[PDB]
Amino acid sequence: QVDKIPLMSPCKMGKFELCHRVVLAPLTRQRSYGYIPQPHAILHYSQRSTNGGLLIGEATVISETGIGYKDVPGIWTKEQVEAWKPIVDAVHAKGGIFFCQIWHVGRVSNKDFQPNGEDPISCTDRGLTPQIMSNGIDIAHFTRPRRLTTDEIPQIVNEFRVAARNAIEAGFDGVEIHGAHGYLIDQFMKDQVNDRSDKYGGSLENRCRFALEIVEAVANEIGSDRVGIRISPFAHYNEAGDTNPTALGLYMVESLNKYDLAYCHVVEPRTESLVPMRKAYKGTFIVAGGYDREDGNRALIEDRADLVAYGRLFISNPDLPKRFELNAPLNKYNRDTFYTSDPIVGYTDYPFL
Ligand SMILES: Cc1cc2nc3c(=O)[nH]c(=O)nc-3n(C[C@H](O)[C@H](O)[C@H](O)COP(=O)(O)O)c2cc1C
């Protein structure tokens, strides 16, 4: 038959027994009209579910103030919680383990997305400069955010708490805290953004307090063994760079050891390495960013991660695990339909072997 490979090796993560190490990375596909999950997602996540395979759903918005893009799903209303259920059940029907990624864009937004035209919230009052959207035809503008006050922050921390609870109500096996790519949590961590003079700014310790308070609220709420967190210390997305990525990364992983989480998901830098973080972190380490079958196997073998998440390739190959397991050809992915809004085209029309 076929020789076993590292990527197909079983794994015990948190309270779960995974059958392989190919993880579906969190992917924003903007096909959730009205911020409500849709029927087509049922088929999407179902095509990608395998027994004991881990799936991390697209970034899900925690509150009205956390919206920065059209058609991204939310999880703060009963209507949204009910819409997720059939999707969750379809993943479970094939034996997959599903984590809901909870998110808040912070300053990466515009007043037109905000309730009452309010300004976006962030750790700073500095806004982003315009960016070109995915289609290379439209320019995205951002409103300057308002700098949250010290005693207002705990309420925001609470929003992640409720979201986490709601995901559990929807049936998710757990939640991944979105602490990467320049969004609210990352905005607080990165020194090029956090210009605060209170206990949530300045030192590396204060800048991580927000994220850590969030990890604490969520773990207490749903149990730490049902909680993961994603970070990208080295990423510069949305003008969120840090002058010492390595220490920032080491600080976070070391600080996360006391929480007994289900896992730490770190994004590879696009020198800088995740090795140190992997070494300092005592739990399950998930890595992502530019992997293929070869690099995946090598990362597992060289002890660089316990799980490897795939994004783009999982978009175009519904059966990525199977293809790696047979070292079969892979469908090419079309970035033109990554963020387009059709219910089928570029979302579920990618073929199986
Ligand atoms: C279309 C698209 C949407 C994404 N959406 C998210 C998201 O919602 N949350 C997140 O944390 N990362 C998101 N990412 C980043 C990916 O999860 C992952 O880190 C990235 O795909 C790196 O791996 P790859 O080389 O296998 O594509 C997205 C990437 C792409 C291409």
Swiss-Prot record:
It is an enzyme of class 1 (oxidoreductase). Keywords: Cytoplasm, Fatty acid biosynthesis, Fatty acid metabolism, Flavoprotein, FMN, Lipid biosynthesis, Lipid metabolism, NADP, Oxidoreductase, Oxylipin biosynthesis. CDD domains: OYE_like_FMN. Constitutively expressed in roots, leaves, cotyledons, cells culture and to a lower extent in flowers. Its EC number is 1.3.1.42. One of its GO terms (biological process) is oxylipin biosynthetic process. The active site is at Y183. It is found in: Cytoplasm. It comes from the Eukaryota. Its cofactor is FMN. One of its GO terms (molecular function) is 12-oxophytodienoate reductase activity. Specifically cleaves olefinic bonds in alpha,beta-unsaturated carbonyls and may be involved in detoxification or modification of these reactive compounds. May be involved in the biosynthesis or metabolism of oxylipin signaling molecules. In vitro, reduces 9R,13R-12-oxophyodienoic acid (9R,13R-OPDA) to 9R,13R-OPC-8:0, but not 9S,13S-OPDA, the natural precursor of jasmonic acid. Also reduces N-ethylmaleimide and maleic acid. This is 12-oxophytodienoate reductase 1. It comes from Solanum lycopersicum (Tomato). The gene is OPR1.
